[PDB]
C-alpha cells in the first residue's frame, strides 16, 4: 500500500 | 467531475473517486525540486513541530477548491493558479515531503 511519501506524489504533484 | 483541470485532475489522481475533498493544492515543478525544499528553510509547522521547511522562492501551483454547490457524486472545483511558497513537513530517509502544510 502507499508510503507518507507515494501519497503525496499523488495527491499534490503534477510535473 | 470532469471538464477544468481540478475536476479532471481530482479524479484521474483518486482524490474524488469515492468522495468530494473540499481542497487540495498541486504543484507544477520537476519532482526533484520540490523533493530539495526539505533541505531549505526550516520553520515551524502550525502544529509546533519543526520539521517543516519552506522553499526559497515561489513554485507554480493550482489551487482547487470545491464550489459551494458541489454534492456527491458530482464534485465541481474552482481552479486557481498561483506561484507561492511552499511549506512542507519532511520525514523519512530520503527526507522527503509527506504533508503540505501552507503555501505562501
Redesign the interface.
Given at each position: 500500500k502507499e508510503t507518507?511519501?507515494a501519497?503525496?506524489?499523488?495527491?499534490?504533484?503534477?510535473? | 467531475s470532469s471538464s477544468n483541470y481540478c475536476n479532471q485532475?481530482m479524479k484521474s489522481?483518486?482524490?474524488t473517486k469515492d468522495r468530494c475533498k473540499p481542497v487540495?493544492?498541486?504543484?507544477?515543478?520537476?519532482?526533484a525540486d520540490?523533493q530539495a525544499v526539505c533541505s531549505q528553510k526550516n520553520v515551524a509547522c502550525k502544529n509546533g513541530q519543526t520539521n517543516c521547511y519552506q522553499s526559497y522562492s515561489t513554485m507554480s501551483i493550482?489551487d482547487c477548491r470545491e464550489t459551494g454547490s458541489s454534492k456527491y457524486p458530482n464534485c465541481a472545483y474552482k481552479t486557481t493558479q498561483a506561484n507561492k511558497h511552499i511549506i512542507?513537513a519532511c520525514?523519512?530517509n530520503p527526507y522527503?515531503?509527506?504533508?503540505?502544510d501552507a503555501s505562501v
Open positions: 507518507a511519501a501519497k503525496f506524489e499523488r495527491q499534490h504533484f503534477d510535473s | 485532475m489522481r483518486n482524490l487540495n493544492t498541486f504543484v507544477h515543478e520537476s519532482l520540490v493550482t512542507v520525514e523519512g522527503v515531503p509527506v504533508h503540505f
